[PDB]
C-alpha cells in the first residue's frame, strides 16, 4: 500500500508526505513548494515531465485546501487551536480525514461522506467539500487510477531496497524494575530488516512463556529494534538464553547466554 498524509495545524503549519507503509518515500517542501524524492526510486516509472503534472494539482490543491479550511472555520465551528489530518492512497483505495484526532469525513467513490458519529459539523463540511462535482471526479481518478499505477512502478523501482535482508545483532542487560527477590532479564535486538522477527527467552529448548516483547521501534538507518524481557526469581536465572530468529539469518539463530558478569 501507498499513501499520502497531510497534517495541518491551525492556531498555519502544513506537512505533506508519501509513504510505503512505514517507509517514507516523498516529502513536500513548502519554501520551494516542490515534491522531494527521498530515494532515487521514489520517482517510480513516472517520467520526469509527468512528475511536474502531479506537482501541479499538489500545488493548487494543497494551498487551496489549507486556505479553504480557514474561511469556513466559522460556519464549520472549527475552534482554534485545531488540527486536520488526511490520509489517502491505495492497496482498493481510501481517503479519510480527521478533525482533532477523531474520524470526521471520508471520500467514498465520488463524494465526501460524513462519519455518522461526527455529527452535523461533518455534514456541513461535506456540503462545502462536495460543492464542485468535477473536483470530486479528479479526487476519484487520483485514487482509483493514478495511485494504483504509481504504486506498481514504485514497488518495482524499489524492489532491491524493499526486499533486502539485514542481519540483527543482540545483547543482554539487567532491567530496571524487578519485584523484590526477582530479576528482569532484557534481550535487546537491533539492526534487522525487514520487520518480522522472533525472540524468546529459553531454558535449553523450552520457550519461556513469561517472555514479554516490547513494541518494534525504528532506527534512523531504517532498521528495527525490539526489547524482550523476562522476570525471574534470582535463584532461578541459571541456564537462561535469549534466542533470535530472523529471515536474514537463514536458520542460524542468534543465541546469547545469561552469565559472566551478568551474575
Amino acid at each position: 500500500s501507498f499513501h499520502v498524509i497531510w497534517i495541518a495545524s491551525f492556531y498555519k503549519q502544513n506537512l505533506v508526505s508519501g509513504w510505503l507503509s512505514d517507509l517514507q518515500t516523498h516529502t513536500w517542501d513548502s519554501n520551494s513548494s516542490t515534491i522531494v524524492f527521498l530515494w532515487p526510486w521514489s520517482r517510480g516509472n513516472f517520467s520526469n515531465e509527468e512528475w511536474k503534472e502531479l506537482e501541479t494539482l499538489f500545488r493548487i490543491r494543497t494551498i487551496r485546501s489549507f486556505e479553504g479550511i480557514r474561511r469556513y472555520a466559522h460556519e464549520l465551528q472549527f475552534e482554534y487551536p485545531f488540527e486536520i489530518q488526511v490520509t489517502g492512497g491505495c492497496e482498493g483505495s481510501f481517503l479519510q480525514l480527521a478533525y482533532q484526532g477523531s474520524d470526521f469525513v471520508s471520500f467514498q467513490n465520488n463524494s465526501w461522506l460524513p462519519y455518522p458519529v461526527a455529527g452535523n459539523m461533518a455534514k456541513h463540511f461535506c456540503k462545502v467539500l462536495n460543492q464542485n462535482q468535477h473536483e470530486n471526479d479528479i479526487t476519484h481518478n487520483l485514487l482509483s487510477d493514478t495511485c494504483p499505477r504509481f504504486i506498481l512502478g514504485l514497488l518495482d523501482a524499489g524492489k532491491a531496497h524493499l526486499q533486502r535482508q539485514v542481519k540483527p545483532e543482540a545483547w543482554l542487560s539487567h532491567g530496571p524494575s524487578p519485584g523484590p527477590g526477582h530479576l528482569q532479564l532484557v534481550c535487546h535486538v537491533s539492526g534487522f530488516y525487514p520487520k518480522p522477527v522472533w525472540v524468546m527467552w529459553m531454558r535449553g529448548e523450552q520457550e519461556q512463556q513469561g517472555t514479554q516483547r516490547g513494541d518494534i521501534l525504528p532506527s534512523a538507518d531504517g532498521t528495527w529494534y525490539l526489547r524482550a524481557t523476562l522476570e525471574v526469581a534470582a535463584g532461578e536465572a541459571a541456564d537462561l538464553s535469549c534466542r533470535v530468529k530472523h529471515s536474514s539469518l537463514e536458520g542460524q539463530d542468534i543465541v546469547l547466554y545469561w552469565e559472566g558478569s551478568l551474575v
Binding site: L15, G101, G175, P176, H188, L217, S219
Partner: protein
Amino acid sequence: IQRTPKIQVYSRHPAENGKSNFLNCYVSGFHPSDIEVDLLKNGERIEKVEHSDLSFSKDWSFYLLYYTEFTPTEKDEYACRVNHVTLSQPKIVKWDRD
C-alpha cells in the same frame, strides 16, 4: 480528545564505553502534535539532535523518532525529556544500561 505520549529510549548498538553509537527516543501515541523533546546528557540538553518527519498512526495519534550520534563513557547518564499539553510537568525517561 488529548492523548499522552508514550516514550521509549534505546541505543542502536550495545553500550560500549568509548565506542560511537546512536541514542534514540521514540515518542508516540500523542495528540495534539505540538510537542517538545530533548535528549539529555548528565541532565544537560544535547545540542544536535535529529528527528524524523512528523507522522501519525491508524488511530490518528502522532509519532516521532528523535536521535543523535554519541560516545558513552562510564560516568555519563542519558535520558529523554518530553513536554506535552497532557503533562503536568516534563516527563523524563532514562536510557537504561548496565
